[PDB]
Design a protein around this ligand. Structure first.
Ligand SMILES: Nc1ncnc2c1ncn2[C@@H]1O[C@H](COP(=O)(O)OP(=O)(O)O)[C@@H](O)[C@H]1O
Ligand SMILES: [Mg+2]
Lengths: 274, 91, 148, 182
């Protein structure tokens, strides 16, 4: 079976018709649908995604094919119906579609982007050519986490640039490729960290998860208090630990295509700016 | 590595992983640029989506002009103006 | 207004005498719809039990041949159409490419309606093996159903 | 990294500082969005302690206040919540009228009008357009998809009993054929 707004309504799925309307009857709605673990909540063509901070199981390929060609008003509110509506307007209307994922840091924008793009490469129906495109984008995600995201006081993995992952189809529906594009990389975080934050954590990965010969040839030192670019009062962060995340990122760089002199050169430039 | 080789007229589906309003207790130049590109981002909602609603709604013969919207061109004019902006006086 | 011709009543007598493996001149209530859907009127189960409960207020389990002529004379005007069937499979085709998915067709034929068993939908997928696997040409399938 | 350091590349301009750089990057982003259709995700965290159960009210009310959601609800209550063209709407929804199902009923917009006049839909609920059919309310499509699902249950019962009829016809032709017809 399925969760349906038709029979046995749960809260309201779309909040546009929710009356009485204030801040309190809307936070009560999000608390109520967060109680029943239905995190997605429409405002029509706009999808609210509350972070469950745990594996909600409704992301299976049976959910993918289950939501394929389903409108906004047949199913429960879920991101695959908006992603599938934009795939319908891409495929049938033959015009470009984009999905703008906003919200606070640590709310799960990057994860929701991975789930959107995973759905898009799933319901395209051309699963042989689009798989390595999606896989290099997803395996390039933690790299850009390391080089582009840092720990603000609120989050621990705060998004500090505008990531933008494309998937590129022919008008006959043939996947050509995909172009990833940065926007608004915060440059001044490299040189100053405001008293509760830390730098882009590839410096902590390079000074923590790296071998001693790699510390020697990059001329670095493991003490965090040596470097002016590098805070000590906010260096240690739990959860996302200054740990073997470095070899996760470097292995991901091996997945994307970086050779060992190439990634060695990249880490050497990171040691030069450090 | 993944490039549209033999480039033709193509169509794109995109995903923008962009922040939300980084409103911190001690804001700085960075959160200023963050809130600013949020202002341009709401301008690309209020321009694209609301004005295609309006050309659609009026074009399909229904008699509306919906009530009001707070346009963000005043805030863009506050920041990105080449003479009276905030970024221009920083330049 | 005959309402039934003589050769057609001869076909009712031939089918009623052929299906009767008991040899007692009557059949049960649970196999009357086997005869009526073998002749090809396609009634429902609830209307059939409504007519059995109408002609039998005690649950005898015996079906008479003039009662069968009365029921088939009542079901004479109930004529379906191939086009409503075809548009129905067009509705269940969520894609519009003419090839309805066999797993989704199995989900409709098992999980919606009167909830058929594994063996009949197994015969349906085995019949759609000539169009399968994974895709079912419903346009050929409705002409293979409604040919005779 | 630096082609500007070529002495054969005389780039004499002063360095753009950060309003030029970040503002030009925003203008590049707006160049890569105005050619496309946007569809939004508004993403909400309940608390900063990464908890899967704890739903702090004040932080989410902070985010509702600054993601602009009540203003979004106000704008989306303008007139509508749903829009479509005529022909896939009549093709998808023609089962709810006795006249349009299964065929056809011409013309397209007129049979659409019969479809809305069949289910006793109020005139305030729908609206007629020139090339598109239009619905104000979400609960209207909740009712239309509810009656559609109730129609498809009867239609699935119809298809399952016609498949039983073709099955019993197949057993009847097999039983007739296996009786040594001379
Ligand atoms: N939809 C989700 N389901 C489960 N966990 C999630 C989800 N979204 C975010 N998370 C959790 O958030 C963490 C990272 O979130 P992220 O996507 O980086 O947030 P943001 O994009 O706002 O920085 C992950 O470790 C994951 O456990
Ligand atoms: Mg992120």
């Amino acid at each position: 079976v399925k969760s349906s707004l038709l029979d046995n309504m749960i809260g309201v799925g779309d909040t546009v018709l929710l009356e009485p309307l204030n801040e309190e009857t809307f936070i009560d709605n999000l608390k109520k649908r967060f109680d029943h673990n239905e995190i997605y909540t429409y405002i029509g063509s706009v999808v609210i995604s509350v972070n469950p901070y745990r594996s909600l199981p409704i992301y299976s390929p049976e959910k993918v094919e289950d939501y394929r060609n389903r409108n906004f008003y047949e199913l429960s509110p879920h991101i695959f119906a908006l992603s599938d509506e934009a795939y319908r307007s891409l495929r049938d209307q033959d015009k470009d579609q984009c999905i703008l994922i906003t919200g606070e840091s640590g709310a799960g924008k990057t994860e929701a982007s991975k789930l959107v793009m995973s759905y898009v490469a799933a319901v395209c129906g051309k699963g042989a050519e689009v798989n390595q495109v999606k896989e290099q984008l997803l395996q390039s995600t933690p790299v850009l986490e390391a080089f582009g995201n840092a720990k603000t006081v609120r989050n621990d993995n705060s998004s500090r640039f505008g990531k933008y992952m494309d998937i590129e189809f022919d008008f006959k529906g043939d996947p050509l490729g995909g172009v990833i594009s940065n926007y608004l990389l915060e440059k001044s975080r490299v040189v100053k960290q405001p008293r509760g934050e830390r730098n882009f954590h590839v410096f902590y990965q390079l000074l923590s998860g790296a071998s001693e010969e790699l510390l020697h040839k990059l001329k670095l030192e493991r003490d965090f208090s040596r470097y002016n670019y590098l805070s000590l009062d906010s260096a240690k962060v739990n959860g996302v630990d200054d740990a073997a995340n470095f070899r996760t990122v470097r292995n991901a760089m091996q997945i994307v295509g970086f050779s060992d002199p190439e990634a060695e050169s990249v880490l050497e430039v990171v040691a030069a700016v450090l | 590595s993944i490039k549209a080789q033999t480039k033709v007229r193509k169509k794109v589906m995109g995903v923008l992983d962009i922040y939300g309003f980084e409103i911190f207790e001690d804001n700085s130049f960075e959160q200023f640029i963050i809130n600013y590109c949020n202002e341009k981002l709401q301008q690309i909602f209020i321009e694209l989506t609301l004005k295609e609603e309006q050309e659609e709604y009026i074009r399909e013969d229904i008699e509306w002009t919906h009530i009001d919207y707070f346009n963000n061109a005043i805030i863009c004019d506050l920041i990105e103006n080449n003479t009276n902006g905030i970024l221009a006086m920083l330049d | 207004a005959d309402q039934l011709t003589e050769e057609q009543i001869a076909e009712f007598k031939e089918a009623f005498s052929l299906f009767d493996k008991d040899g007692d001149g009557t059949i049960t209530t649970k196999e009357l719809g086997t005869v009526m859907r073998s002749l090809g009127q396609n009634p429902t189960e609830a209307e059939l039990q409504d007519m059995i409960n109408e002609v039998d207020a005690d649950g005898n389990g015996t079906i008479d041949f003039p009662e069968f002529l009365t029921m088939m004379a009542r079901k004479m005007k109930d004529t379906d159409s191939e086009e409503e069937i075809r548009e129905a499979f067009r509705v269940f085709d969520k894609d519009g490419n003419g090839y309805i998915s066999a797993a989704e067709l199995r989900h409709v034929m098992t999980n919606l309606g009167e909830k058929l068993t594994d063996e009949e939908v197994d015969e349906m997928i085995r019949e759609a093996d000539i169009d399968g696997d994974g895709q079912v040409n419903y346009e050929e399938f409705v002409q293979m159903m409604t040919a005779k | 990294l630096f082609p500007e350091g070529n002495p054969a590349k005389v780039n004499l301009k002063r360095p753009p500082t950060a309003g030029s750089q970040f503002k030009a990057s925003v203008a590049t982003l707006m160049k890569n969005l105005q050619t496309k259709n946007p569809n939004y995700i508004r993403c909400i965290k309940p608390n900063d302690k990464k908890a899967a159960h704890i739903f702090s009210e004040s932080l989410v009310c902070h985010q509702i206040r600054y993601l602009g959601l009540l203003e979004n609800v106000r704008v989306r209550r303008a007139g509508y919540a749903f829009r479509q063209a005529y022909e896939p709407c009549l093709e998808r929804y023609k089962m709810l009228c006795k006249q349009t199902w299964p065929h056809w009923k011409g013309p397209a917009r007129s049979g659409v009008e019969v479809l809305f006049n069949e289910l006793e839909i109020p005139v305030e609920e729908y609206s007629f357009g020139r090339s598109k059919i239009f619905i104000r309310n979400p609960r209207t499509l909740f009712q239309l998809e509810d009656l559609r699902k109730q129609r498809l249950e009867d239609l699935a019962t119809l298809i399952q009993k016609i498949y039983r009829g073709w099955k019993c016809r197949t057993h009847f032709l097999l039983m007739k054929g296996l009786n040594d017809i001379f």
